């Protein structure tokens, strides 16, 4: 039915009028029952993670008591379904197995990774008191869960020697974006509090700010990376790798980013574009620009960063720095808006742009052109407000069809929920 995306290539319009630019469609269909939902009032579906493999997809969501950024975690649900076609205009889902992780009060975060008829879930846990009370924001180990169609899941426990992370960490959070599976290994992205014992020269790149350099005197850029203004603790990102995933004894290794080329740690994702790889890092401080890196392999040294702005995060932000010259300051954004590449150098890609309105939000869907142009279409004019987005394209009926998973509120007075949609990417040349 569906196949891993094969990128459009210019097979025409290569004479003189050669603007081979793709654009989104004109319809924004729905994908009902992507994951089980409810209608209770004291619930918030808050943290989604979506991934599509060769034919199957993995989906995970988080349910909180009353608050969306906080509150006791009622449960975490994972759905293993297959993308199929039932004669309707667009693609459709068909869950095969719904699963709830045991003891959801010990989890810090979770993410999924869909391969070839095989699903993976990796969750970081926190230290448990003598009574078993979860000591929040501590780190103890990992759980790796194996998923196969028509097959009971298998759980792997990773603790002690099984994980050797570069620096000593105290709290670890797995990026909600997820990961990939190549060969007999896995690749996620994690962030946490890392105790630094050297000099910090944090990355400080900003526009023409003339206040005091816009706080560009690097004291504030260093201040942002520090935990509570202490040099001894930092918030940093790091690659994560699992060895011998087939063997029943996996092992974990990490690779921490230098602060000299990074911003405060946040959620991110791992891509598998072409034969290369990719990584997206969500804004978490004054800098609200796009942060994407294309790497020949999975190594901090070999990572190369993109030089594009959109999508400029503009929601769930506390900053006040013009987006013409992002002037370093101090704030805490809590949004998420990833970009799915549509080329080998990722000069094509597609994203979801959210802009806040007097009330709620106004959103649009766009596909970035390598020439710098964009093609934008307004979407969801009924919903009160949406906050995050996640895209995962694929080949389906000799065409590129993408599924956008979002969360928000259709009615102002309803709790936060998760909504799924799909659209089409069509290639054409002027």
């Amino acid at each position: 039915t569906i196949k891993p995306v094969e990128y459009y290539k210019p097979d025409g319009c290569n004479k003189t009028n050669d603007h081979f630019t793709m654009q989104p469609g004109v319809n924004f269909y729905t994908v009902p029952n992507l994951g089980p939902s409810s209608s209770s009032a004291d619930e918030c579906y808050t943290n989604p993670s979506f991934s599509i493999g060769s034919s199957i997809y993995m989906f995970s969501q988080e349910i909180r008591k009353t608050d969306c950024t906080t509150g006791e975690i009622l449960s975490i649900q994972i759905v293993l379904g297959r993308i199929v076609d039932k004669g309707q205009q667009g693609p459709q889902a068909s869950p095969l197995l719904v699963w709830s992780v045991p003891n959801p009060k010990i989890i810090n975060s979770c993410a999924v990774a869909a391969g070839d008829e095989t699903g993976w879930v990796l969750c970081s846990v926190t230290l448990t008191a003598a009574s078993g009370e979860p000591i929040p924001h501590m780190f103890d180990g990992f759980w790796l869960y194996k998923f196969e169609p028509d097959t009971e899941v298998v759980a792997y426990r990773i603790t002690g020697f099984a994980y050797l992370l570069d620096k000593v960490y105290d709290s670890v959070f797995i990026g909600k974006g997820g990961g990939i599976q190549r060969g007999n290994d896995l690749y996620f992205q994690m962030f946490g509090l890392s105790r630094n014992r050297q000099s910090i020269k944090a990355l400080c790149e900003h526009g023409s700010c003339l206040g005091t350099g816009g706080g560009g005197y690097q004291v504030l850029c260093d201040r942002a990376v520090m935990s509570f203004g202490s040099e001894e603790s930092l918030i940093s990102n790091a690659y994560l790798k699992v060895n011998d995933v087939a063997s029943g004894k996996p092992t974990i290794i990490s690779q921490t980013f230098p602060p000299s080329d990074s911003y405060k740690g946040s959620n991110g994702r791992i891509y598998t574009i072409g034969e290369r790889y990719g990584i997206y890092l969500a804004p978490s401080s004054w800098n609200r620009y796009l942060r994407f890196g294309l790497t020949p392999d999975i190594s901090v040294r070999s990572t190369t960063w993109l030089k594009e702005k959109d999508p400029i995060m503009k929601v769930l932000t506390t900053c006040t720095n013009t987006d013409k010259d992002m002037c370093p300051e101090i704030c805490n954004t809590r949004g998420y808006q990833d970009i799915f590449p549509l080329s080998e150098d990722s000069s094509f890609y597609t994203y979801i742009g959210i802009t806040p309105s007097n009330e709620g939000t106004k959103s649009f869907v766009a596909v970035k052109d390598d020439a710098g142009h964009v093609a934008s279409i307004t979407i969801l004019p009924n919903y009160y407000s949406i906050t995050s987005a996640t895209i995962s394209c694929f080949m389906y009926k000799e065409e590129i069809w993408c599924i956008a998973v979002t969360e928000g509120r259709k009615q102002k007075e309803n709790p936060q929920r998760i909504y799924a949609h799909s659209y089409r990417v069509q290639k054409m040349c002027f």
């Epitope: 729905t30 009902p32 089980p36 409810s38 209608s39 009032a41 009615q411 929920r417």
Partner: antibody, heavy 120, light 108 residues
Amino acid sequence: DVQLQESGPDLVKPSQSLSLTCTVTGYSITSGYSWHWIRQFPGNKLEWMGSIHFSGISNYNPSLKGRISITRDTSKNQFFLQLNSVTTEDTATYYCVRKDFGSSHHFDYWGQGTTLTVSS
Amino acid sequence: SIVMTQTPKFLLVSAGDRVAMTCKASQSVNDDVAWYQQKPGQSPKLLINFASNRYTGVPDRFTGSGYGTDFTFTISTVQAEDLAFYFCQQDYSSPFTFGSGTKLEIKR
């Protein structure tokens, strides 16, 4: 299971006021879901009247011209309808209906309905 | 408000035949539409939602399609107990409206 059951007067003189009462058993009105009133004239045409969100807010059809009022009594787990200055045009069958805002987005459970006649 | 025009009002067909009814709106409502069936002396029951999905437990004879403004509801083969009242309801925005409905009777 959730079970809606209407009750009230069925013969009303012109220009009087109408007071319906929908009783819900097996599910608290405050927990979730919306709750609406929908009338079906002879000829089977249908029309929405209004609702009352589970928090307490109430919404009304603009065409009713503000002659309608929806209230709730949480102690008895009920919600009522008030219509003023009724006439022979307001002869129909009235339902109290639950609505889901989660996965379905549809009117799930409906009451048996009550017949209302306006005459002198 | 959003106006829903539903045609045709009366359909008389023989057992096994297929039928099609059209429900049209006055402005774009994307795919927020549903189709209900009301048996005589019975509350309505959802039959199609999102203008194409088949609700759980609904047999395969019923099918829906359409996006934007023009919508269609079709039955592959009419059975004996399929005579009922069918109407289209939109959920784009409040106030919710219903189509005028359609009446189905069986030839014999």
